[PDB]
Design a binder for this molecule. Structure first.
Ligand SMILES: *[C@@H]1O[C@H](CO)[C@@H](O)[C@H](O)[C@H]1NC(C)=O
Ligand SMILES: *[C@@H]1O[C@H](CO)[C@@H](O)[C@H](O)[C@H]1NC(C)=O
Ligand SMILES: *[C@@H]1O[C@H](CO)[C@@H](O)[C@H](O)[C@H]1NC(C)=O
Ligand SMILES: [Ca+2]
Ligand SMILES: [Ca+2]
Ligand SMILES: [Ca+2]
Length: 486
């Protein structure tokens, strides 16, 4: 499926000036030192998460810092992503900072939850340490980007516990020594993220790793035609056609989803099925051994049947937001809970807070204010609960409804407990800054179309790469030309 495939995190590392000074003003030392940290973090990911950490790019600030590095990991993280948005022009799944300085709290790093593949959120910041120690810091930073959050609700209950206390578990920063393993709960959180449609950019295999070619690492570099895993794992797949990184007589490929016996899989063979209704299925090219780079519908397509809208391959509904914060057993409150409590302007329903006084929602923006769920807990899966749980009770001519809420903080700016931006609030209307606005107020980019009022000439789907994925028998960058082939 999608959780059985090997994932690949194309990673870029940025070393600041203090990291450069930690290695005697030597560029070669810093870069090889950072490769070691990545290499060890790869070994942790390689087995447990069925995911590989591939270093694709790196830069070192030999002269000075481009921005003011902060003692607060979150402030540094935010300013670092600003730098990478405006200055970093190399392609990567995630960009991480290697800081020579030290942060205030025992938190050795900060990274955005479910951040990968994103331009503004795909990255983290990591403080200096030992090679073995920093690899753990990177392993938990990338885990956050990857969707592994370490469920607080299950932790407080005692549901999820570190079974192998082999110097503890990684997402258990509760104790600090040398955590080498993820909990089974961690693996599930990662699977759920991939099945949710997250991490689409984690499905392509790199070729030229920033290190000289070596036959037998499982990566097709310069000079070598094929490459199976290693002589041991090679026997399972590829040993029949690959020999000394060279193809045999009857072979087009060695290993991959689009490689049957030792030959290619016919063009149009389903190699990857859609994980959700935001996703697009992938077909074998008939030309490559790899299953084509994982792509999905562009941001704007409705999901869950008009109830949600796709963003980054993930569906945004109020019910899914309630489950993300409070647990799978929790459901979103009735639309009436919103329609009545949010116009009041109390702690029990509002459009935000001003000067210690709650803002009462307009009747138009009633689904974009305070997030209301049904039977809520008192310990969120992530973030910090800021205060007490809201719980009012409204009657509806025979149906007594339970509307509940809570203020869950991640950033000092970002607050979960209010309807997330992009969530549908009506036909062709979404939430933005606690306001129900038309789809135009988001100015989505579009694919090419040669028919008035259609997406991809009405014969295709607009991908997140802003390319037209045509239906059968239709060709062209706009899917406007009919070309059947049988
Ligand atoms: C491989 O085949 C595809 C057709 O699926 C074609 O578009 C592409 O140009 C080919 N690439 C090479 C290098 O032959
Ligand atoms: C309403 O939900 C709260 C938690 O959100 C719960 O404590 C309370 O018992 C519920 N009330 C009813 C009527 O079930
Ligand atoms: C789309 O709407 C306007 C365009 O003038 C502006 O706020 C911005 O470009 C876009 N808004 C967002 C949320 O990015
Ligand atoms: Ca990638
Ligand atoms: Ca190799
Ligand atoms: Ca896909």
């Amino acid at each position: 499926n999608v959780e059985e495939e090997t994932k690949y995190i194309e990673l870029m590392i940025v070393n600041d000036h203090l990291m450069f000074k930690k290695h005697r003003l030597s560029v070669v030392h810093t870069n090889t030192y950072a490769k070691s940290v990545v290499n060890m973090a790869d070994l942790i990911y390689k087995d447990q998460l069925k995911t590989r950490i591939v270093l694709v790019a790196m830069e070192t600030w030999a002269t000075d810092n481009k921005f003011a590095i902060s003692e607060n990991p979150l402030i540094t993280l935010r300013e670092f992503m600003k730098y990478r948005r405006d200055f970093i022009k190399e392609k990567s799944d995630a960009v991480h900072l290697f800081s020579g300085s030290q942060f205030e709290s025992s938190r050795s790093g900060a990274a955005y939850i479910g951040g990968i593949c994103s331009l503004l959120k795909g990255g983290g910041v990591n403080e200096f340490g030992k090679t073995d120690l920093m690899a753990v810091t990177l392993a938990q930073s990338l885990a956050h980007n990857i969707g592994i959050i370490s469920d607080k609700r299950k932790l407080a209950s005692g549901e999820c516990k570190c079974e192998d206390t082999w110097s503890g578990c990684i997402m258990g920063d509760t104790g600090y020594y040398l955590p080498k393993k993820f909990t089974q709960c961690n693996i599930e959180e990662y699977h759920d993220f991939l099945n949710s449609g997250g991490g689409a950019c984690l499905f392509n295999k790199p070729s030229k790793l920033l290190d000289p070619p070596e036959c037998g690492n499982g990566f097709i570099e310069t000079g070598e035609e094929c490459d199976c895993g290693t002589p041991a794992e090679c026997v399972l797949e590829g040993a029949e056609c690959c020999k000394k990184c060279t193809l045999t007589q009857d072979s087009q490929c060695s290993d991959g989803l689009c490689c049957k016996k030792c030959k290619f899989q016919p063009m149009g063979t389903v190699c990857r099925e859609a994980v959700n209704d935001c996703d697009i299925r992938e077909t074998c090219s008939g030309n490559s051994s790899q299953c084509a780079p994982n792509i999905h519908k562009m941001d704007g397509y409705s999901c869950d049947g008009v109830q949600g809208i796709c963003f980054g391959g993930r569906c945004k509904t109020r019910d899914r937001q309630c489950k993300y914060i409070w647990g799978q057993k929790v459901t979103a409150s009735d639309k009436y809970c919103y329609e009545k409590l949010n116009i009041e302007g109390t702690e029990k329903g509002n459009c935000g807070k001003d000067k210690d006084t709650w803002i009462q929602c307009n009747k138009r923006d009633v689904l974009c204010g305070y997030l209301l769920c049904t039977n809520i807990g008192n310990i969120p899966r992530l973030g910090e609960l800021d205060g007490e749980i809201t719980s009012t009770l409204v009657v509806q001519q025979g149906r007594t409804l339970n509307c509940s809420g809570g203020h869950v903080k991640l950033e000092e700016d970002v607050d979960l407990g209010y309807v997330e931006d992009g969530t549908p609030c009506g036909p062709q209307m979404m939430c933005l800054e606690h306001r129900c606005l038309p789809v135009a107020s988001f100015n989505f980019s579009t694919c090419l179309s040669s028919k008035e009022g259609t997406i991809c000439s009405g014969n295709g789907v607009c991908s997140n790469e802003l390319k037209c994925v045509c239906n059968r028998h239709w060709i062209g960058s706009d899917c406007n030309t009919y070309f059947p082939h049988n």
